[PDB]
Amino acid sequence: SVWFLDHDYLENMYGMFKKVNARERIVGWYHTGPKLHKNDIAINELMKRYCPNSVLVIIDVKPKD
Amino acid sequence: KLLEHKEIDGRLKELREQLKELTKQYEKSENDLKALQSVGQIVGEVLKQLTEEKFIVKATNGPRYVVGCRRQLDKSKLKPGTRVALDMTTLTIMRYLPREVDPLVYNMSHEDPGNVSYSEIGGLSEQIRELREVIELPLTNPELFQRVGIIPPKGCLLYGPPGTGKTLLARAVASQLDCNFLKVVSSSIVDKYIGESARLIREMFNYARDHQPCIIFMDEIDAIGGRRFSEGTSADREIQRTLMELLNQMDGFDTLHRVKMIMATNRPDTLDPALLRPGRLDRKIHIDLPNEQARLDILKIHAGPITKHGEIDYEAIVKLSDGFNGADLRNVCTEAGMFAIRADHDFVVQEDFMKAVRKVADSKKLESKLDYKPV
Incomplete structure (x- = not known):
C-alpha cells in the first residue's frame, strides 16, 4: 500500500516528450518484476486515470527463453 | 444579503x-503544435503497377521514382491513373487522393447546359414528335430493340436553318428527355x-455512358x-477521319x-x-x-420575360418584320x-417593339460570318 508516483515528473516529462512528438501520448505504464505484485492493480487505477484505455507491459530486463 | 451573494456568484460564473x-485557446495551441509535426507528401500520379509491392509513379514536377505502398493502402484503389501522396523522404505511397482541376476536361464533361423550356422557339412539330420518338424507344426499352435485333439507332441529324433551330432548340432537346446533355462542339x-x-x-462517350438519360449532342461539330x-x-x-x-x-x-x-448538327458542310x-x-x-x-408564337415566348404597356399587337410587330x-x-x-430604356419607360409600348422590328428587318437584310450548310 506504500506506493508513490510523482505527479510532477509524470506531467512535466510527458508534456516535454509530447512537444517532441505530437503522435506520442500516454498509452500505459511498464514494470519489471515478472511476478505481478498485488500493488499493480492500485498503480493501475492511477494509470487508468491518466489514460482512458491504458495498458501494463511486464517487460523483463533479464531475458530468458 | 442572499440576493447580493447570488450576484457575487454570477460574477464568478x-x-x-x-x-x-x-x-x-490552450486547445488551439495543442492542435497547432500537433500540426507542426506533419511534413507533407509529394503529389504524384501512378504511371503503372510494377509489382504488388512496388508501383512506378511520376511526381507532378517531373522526376519519376519507383515507390512501394505503405500500410492498408487499398492497392485495388491504387490502380494506375490515380493521384497518390508520396513521402517527402521515404518516397513511398502514403494515401490515395483523387483531385484534378481538369479545366479542358470540364469543357468535355458537363459544361453544356440544358434549356428547361419545352418550346423556347416553338417549332416542335417534329422536334417533340420524330426527334422524341426515335430517341425514346431505345431509351425506354433497349431490350425491345434487342428482341427486334436491330441495333438501336445511335444518332439523328437535325439539319435546319442556322440560329432558328441551331442557336435555340439545341438544348431544348435536353428538357424533352429531362437530362443534361454533352455538347460536341x-x-x-x-x-x-x-x-x-x-x-x-x-x-x-464514357462520360455519357455514366448517365443513361444524358444524350450526346454533336452541336456545331464543324x-x-x-x-x-x-x-x-x-x-x-x-x-472527316x-x-x-x-x-x-x-x-x-x-x-x-x-x-x-445524335449528330443533331447542320454545321457540317x-x-x-x-x-x-x-x-x-x-x-x-x-x-x-x-x-x-x-x-x-415564338415572339410570345420571347415576350414572356418582358414588362409591357399591354396595348401590344404582337401579330402586327411579327407582320412588320x-x-x-x-x-x-x-x-x-x-x-x-x-427602345423602352430610351425615355425611361419600364413598360414596352407596341411602337417600341415595332421600332425594334424595323431595326431587326435591317439586320435580317444584312448578315455575316455564316459559312455552314447541311449537305
Whole structure:
C-alpha cells in the first residue's frame, strides 16, 4: 500500500516528450518484476486515470527463453 | 444579503466563462503544435503497377521514382491513373487522393447546359414528335430493340436553318428527355493532337455512358478554332477521319446505357453518305423556316420575360418584320427593351417593339460570318 508516483515528473516529462512528438501520448505504464505484485492493480487505477484505455507491459530486463 | 451573494456568484460564473475561453485557446495551441509535426507528401500520379509491392509513379514536377505502398493502402484503389501522396523522404505511397482541376476536361464533361423550356422557339412539330420518338424507344426499352435485333439507332441529324433551330432548340432537346446533355462542339476535343480528337471523344462517350438519360449532342461539330480543315496540303480532313472513327465508336465498341450519340448538327458542310446509311444515321429530322404564325408564337415566348404597356399587337410587330430567326425574334424583344430604356419607360409600348422590328428587318437584310450548310 506504500506506493508513490510523482505527479510532477509524470506531467512535466510527458508534456516535454509530447512537444517532441505530437503522435506520442500516454498509452500505459511498464514494470519489471515478472511476478505481478498485488500493488499493480492500485498503480493501475492511477494509470487508468491518466489514460482512458491504458495498458501494463511486464517487460523483463533479464531475458530468458 | 442572499440576493447580493447570488450576484457575487454570477460574477464568478462570468469569470468561469472567461476560463473556458482560455482553455479553448490552450486547445488551439495543442492542435497547432500537433500540426507542426506533419511534413507533407509529394503529389504524384501512378504511371503503372510494377509489382504488388512496388508501383512506378511520376511526381507532378517531373522526376519519376519507383515507390512501394505503405500500410492498408487499398492497392485495388491504387490502380494506375490515380493521384497518390508520396513521402517527402521515404518516397513511398502514403494515401490515395483523387483531385484534378481538369479545366479542358470540364469543357468535355458537363459544361453544356440544358434549356428547361419545352418550346423556347416553338417549332416542335417534329422536334417533340420524330426527334422524341426515335430517341425514346431505345431509351425506354433497349431490350425491345434487342428482341427486334436491330441495333438501336445511335444518332439523328437535325439539319435546319442556322440560329432558328441551331442557336435555340439545341438544348431544348435536353428538357424533352429531362437530362443534361454533352455538347460536341469539338473545339475542346481537338486541342494539340489531330489524332487525340477521336480518343477525347471516346472519353466523352464514357462520360455519357455514366448517365443513361444524358444524350450526346454533336452541336456545331464543324465549328473549330479558325475554320474546319477539309483535305488540303497544309491540313487534311482530320475531322472527316474523326467522323469515320466516330462511326466505329458509335456502333460495337462503344454502345451501352441506351445513350444516343445524335449528330443533331447542320454545321457540317458535307454529310458522309455511309453515315446516312440506316444505323449510323437511321433518320434525319429537318428544322423548317417559321410559318410567321409560328413566329408570332415564338415572339410570345420571347415576350414572356418582358414588362409591357399591354396595348401590344404582337401579330402586327411579327407582320412588320419577317425575321425568320428565333434569335432575330429574341433580338426584336431585346431591342424593344432598348427602345423602352430610351425615355425611361419600364413598360414596352407596341411602337417600341415595332421600332425594334424595323431595326431587326435591317439586320435580317444584312448578315455575316455564316459559312455552314447541311449537305
